[PDB]
Structures are given as C-alpha cells and as structure tokens.
C-alpha cells in the first residue's frame, strides 16, 4: 500500500497584497516537491534526491499548475471572505488536500479530497467521487456551484487516473529509498524519579515509515497504565522516532516489557532493560 | 466579412479571439496583440468570454491605471464600468489586471508572466 | 448584434468547423440526439491540436466514439475504427482535460456539437 498526497495552504495578508501559497507533495511519508510563492524561486522544486533528474518539461508544467492554483485561491479567499461576511482587515487561511491510496495489489484503493477555511472543514469530495458535500451551513453555496459545474469529474479522474499512474512513476524513480523498509533501533532506559518510583522509557529510533505502536505490559500481562506516549517525531534524515514510558515501583522493573510493532519488523519485538 | 479570424483563432459574436497558452508579461502581450493586428482583450460585459466560462486560467486584459484621469481605463481610452469588477477600488494602481472568463479579476504586477487574449473587431 | 453567417447564431467557429459549447449535462445517447436535433454531429476529435483548443474552452465532453460489448473495437460515428487511444462497463468516449477516456454511457456529461 502506497500513497501520493498533496497539501496546499494559502494564507492571506492584508498588508503585502498577494496571499502566500505553499504546496508540498508527499509519497508515503517522504516529501519530494514543494512550491512557495514567497521564496527565491517562485516555482516548483525538488525536495528529494530522486527528483533531481527531472527535466524542464516537468518542473515547468508543475509550476504552471502551482501558480495557477494560487491565483484561483487568491480569488477564493476573497470569494469566501464574502460568504462569511468578513472583515476585509483580518487574515484568513484556505487549505486543500487530496491523495490516492493504492491497495496492496498496487492498484487504486481509494481517493480523498477536501477544502478547509480557517482550520474548519469547508467542502469534502464524496467517497464515490461523484459529488461534493458542503460542511459549514455556508459552504452549501460552493457545493451547488461545483455540483452544477460538475467539477466532481475532472477531480474523480485525477485521483483514479493521473494520480495513480504517477504514484507508480515516482515509486519507480525513487525505488531504492521509497521502498526500503527501515525497522526501529529499539532499546529501554531507566530513569529514577524518587527513591520509590522509576521511569522505564522504551525507545524506537531511525525508522520508516512513521506508523508504529510501542506498548507496555508487565507481569500479569496486557496494558498496565500510568503511561506516557509522545507524538511520533521526525529525525530529519527521513526516518522517525517515538518513545513510550511508564512509571514503576522500584525493583519491579523486570516485570515490564515493551512491545514494538512496525512494518519493518519480521514480527513484534519486546524489550526489558 | 465576419468569418475571417485567422487560424487557431476562434470567432464568436462576429469577433476574432485568440486565447493563448504561451505566457508573457503585460507590455509584452500588449505588443504581441498589436503585431497580430488586434487588441489586448477589452471587455464589454462579463458575457463576452461566455463560450469559455468553464475556464480557470487568468488572462491579461487591456486594463491599466491612468495617472492622468486618476481612473482605470481600457486601452481604447474609454472608462471602466463601475460594475464589471466590483473591487476595482482595491486594485493597486501600479498593477495591471488579469481576467478569468467566469467574471473574476486579479490585479498583478505588470511584470508577472501571464496568459493573454487577443481580440479583433469586425464592424 | 451581428454573428457569422456560415455557423448558427450563438455558435463559435474555430477551424473550418462550427462548435456548440453545451453547458447542459446529458447522457451519451441524449447528446447524440440533441446534436442531431441541432442539425449537426456529435463532437469529433480531428487533430491532437484541435484538442488543445477544445481543452481550453471546455474541460470535458462526450465524443462520437463507442463500443458495443465491453469488447469490440472502438468505433467512430462513421462505423469506422477510431485512430486515437483511450483509457469496466464503460463504452462511450469522453474528452477530459486534453485526454481521451472511457466513461459510463449512462453518465450525464457535457456535450458539444460540430460541423464540417
């Protein structure tokens, strides 16, 4: 299973006219292209080593797309500021994301796409990709002006056709990295809080993809509790890190175990200290 | 006549339009339209590019700010209807305008590269 | 309000041939008849450049190309064999953003007419 996700953000700026518009493209959990109409290069650039072999033909077309999307948004922001009867003084945020998921079989599994205005769900593309559904009792306007216009189509077509075919085009281009599974370098540490309690912090380092699990159990078996779990953070080298700790009455440390579930693992590991 | 319209040019309401895909600046497009012996698009009503209303691109039109009359003016000297683009108020007078068959206008830098539309009258 | 003499009133002319930008959504069959009611044929795709034009005017549209069973040859309106490429129970051809695709003959889509 793989995915081609794109994330588009347009923030408006009352002062300096043109709203800022940023696009990032992720294959799986690897970013490869970005566009930033506020940088040294107002065009689409590569963010992955395996894209620096593409030609003008591609970098141009994609800039055509990015720049054109950004104008549509400059409008939209206005268009919306209208609907929501908003202060022309304030600054607001329009977000758009879409992506295609391939089944294990390598072929299209499902597609998604939706808009958001000011951190709130605005418009969503129906599962069946055949129509748009408003969310705010004010996106109803954009609904029937997209169902009518029947944009549902060219969109349903992107996800199933272009997006899928391209995802494959990318997975091939970046074969060596995108596809290689990198299991976590697990290991437990001890951290006394007082004479009575100690923290057992189970680590998971340098892994990819970013989905994982980390679970504590002990003597007895499943669960325990009095646990802390942190958001899976990026290392920066493309891999990730997560840790799960638990507090333990001293001496009992060896009752507890940590169960790491990852896709890079033959089967779940277990740690002790 | 009324059925000339070069080739790769499209005729409508007895006028000869030319939606480009090529992208150039304003002063550039202005001159290109001149060579082809036509004008940078000048809108009557938003129903002029009706046949293209499904478009999402933005094309340079022939609007600019007149230092002289302290007003936005078409290239032909005539003034801009208060209606066409309702926000003309907030266009920066240092920018040129780019239009979209829907009815939407954007004021961008006279330098920025954009698509253009040429028009030939026939009356 | 003067308009061209060779082509119908609100129609547009591009390359020796006249066009009618639909804006109404109809099924392949409905479109077929409509275009005929308007004394013309359904939209045919002459050149791969007439297609870069068409893709600037309207995003998607039915075209005069279909299949009988989910497998016989793709056929133009002239009973002839189609000489371009095109993407289940789909049997009518559409034009979608400068590409030719297979769609559901029962789907409602935009249609354009075209003359010689």
């Amino acid at each position: 299973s793989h995915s081609l996700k794109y994330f588009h953000t347009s923030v408006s700026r009352p002062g300096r006219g043109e709203p800022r518009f940023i696009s990032v493209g992720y294959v799986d959990d690897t970013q490869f292209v970005r566009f930033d109409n506020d940088a040294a290069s107002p065009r689409m650039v590569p963010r992955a080593p395996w894209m620096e072999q593409e030609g003008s033909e591609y970098w141009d077309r994609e800039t055509r797309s990015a720049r054109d999307t950004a104008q549509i948004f400059r409008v939209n922001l206005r268009t919306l500021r209208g609907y929501y009867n908003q202060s022309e003084a304030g600054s607001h945020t329009l977000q758009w994301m879409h992506g295609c998921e391939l089944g294990p079989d390598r072929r299209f599994l499902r597609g998604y796409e939706q808009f958001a205005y000011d951190g709130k769900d605005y418009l969503t593309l129906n599962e069946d990709l055949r129509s748009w559904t408003a969310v705010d009792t004010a996106a109803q306007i954009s609904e029937q002006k997209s169902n009518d216009a029947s944009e549902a189509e060219h969109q349903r077509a992107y996800l199933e056709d272009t997006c899928v075919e391209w995802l494959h085009k990318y997975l091939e281009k970046g074969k060596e990295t995108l596809l290689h599974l990198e299991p976590p370098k697990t290991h437990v540490t001890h951290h006394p809080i007082s004479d009575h309690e100690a923290t057992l912090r189970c680590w998971a380092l340098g892994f990819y993809p970013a989905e994982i699990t980390l679970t504590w159990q002990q003597d007895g078996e499943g669960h325990t509790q009095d646990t802390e779990l942190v958001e899976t953070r990026p290392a920066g080298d493309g891999t990730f890190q997560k840790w799960a700790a638990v507090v333990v009455p001293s001496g009992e440390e060896q009752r507890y175990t940590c169960h790491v579930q990852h896709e890079g693992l033959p089967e779940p590991v277990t740690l002790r200290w | 006549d009324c059925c000339s319209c070069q080739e790769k040019w499209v005729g409508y309401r007895c006028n000869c339009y030319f939606i480009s895909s090529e992208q150039k600046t304003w002063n550039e497009s202005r001159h290109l339209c001149a060579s082809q012996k036509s004008s940078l698009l000048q809108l009557q009503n938003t129903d002029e590019l009706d046949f293209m209303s499904s478009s999402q691109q933005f094309y340079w039109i022939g609007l600019s700010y007149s230092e002289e009359h302290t007003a936005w003016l078409w290239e032909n000297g005539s003034a801009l209807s208060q209606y066409l683009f309702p926000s003309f108020e907030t266009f920066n007078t240092k920018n040129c305008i780019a239009y979209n068959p829907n009815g939407n206008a954007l004021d961008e830098s006279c330098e920025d590269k954009n698509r253009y539309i040429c028009k030939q009258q026939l009356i | 309000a003067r308009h061209c003499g060779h082509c119908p009133e609100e129609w547009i002319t591009y390359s020796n041939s006249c066009y009618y930008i639909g804006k109404e959504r109809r099924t392949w069959e409905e479109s077929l008849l409509a275009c005929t009611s308007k004394n013309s044929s359904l939209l045919s795709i002459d050149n791969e450049e007439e297609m870069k034009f068409l893709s600037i005017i309207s995003p998607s549209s039915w075209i005069g190309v279909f299949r009988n069973s989910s497998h016989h040859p793709w056929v133009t309106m002239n009973g002839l064999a189609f000489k371009h490429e095109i993407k289940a129970e789909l049997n009518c051809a559409v034009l979608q953003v400068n590409r030719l695709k297979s769609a559901q003959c029962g789907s409602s889509i935009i249609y354009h007419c075209k003359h010689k």
Partner: peptide, 9 residues
C-alpha cells in the same frame, strides 16, 4: 504531479 484543475468555491 498536482491535480490539474482545482475548484472555484
């Protein structure tokens, strides 16, 4: 490659 066309809300 990002969706060709977006949406005019």
């Amino acid at each position: 490659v990002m969706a060709p066309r977006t949406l005019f809300l």
